[PDB]
Amino acid sequence: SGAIYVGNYRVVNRHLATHNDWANLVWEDSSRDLLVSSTTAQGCDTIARCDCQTGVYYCSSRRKHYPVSFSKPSLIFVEASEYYPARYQSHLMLAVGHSEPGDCGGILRCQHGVVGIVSTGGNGLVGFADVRDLLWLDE
């Protein structure tokens, strides 16, 4: 679990969105596994606006933050899970690192701010849903 809180927005994995998220919906995209809802209080996270390929992510199944090198956002085939059939997920970046299903939502960040959140994993890989192209999150 986990979310990004920027301005009056809450960014979560679409597959983990709550009923309150759907009832206060701003935008959602199943192909990216992202959903954004509106919040009453203002958030403290800042979104990175860069092309960094190194950063640090939070792994809840280890209570640890790990530094990683990650690929550029791309269209990647993701195997069938209990939340989605086997499909191509877009705007996804891969890194070598530990992940388990409940790790989705953990933040990946670089020197400029938040880059994205954990969305996929398995076999010593972790995939992050990028949010750096969503310029409207800052307005």
Ligand SMILES: COc1ccccc1[C@H](N)C(=O)N1CCC[C@H](C(N)=O)C1
């Ligand atoms: C962090 O997730 C994992 C980590 C290790 C092993 C396996 C997993 C998950 N079975 C996983 O990859 N997904 C399940 C949740 C939906 C994901 C998606 N965005 O399509 C795919």
Ligand SMILES: [Zn+2]
């Ligand atoms: Zn950066």
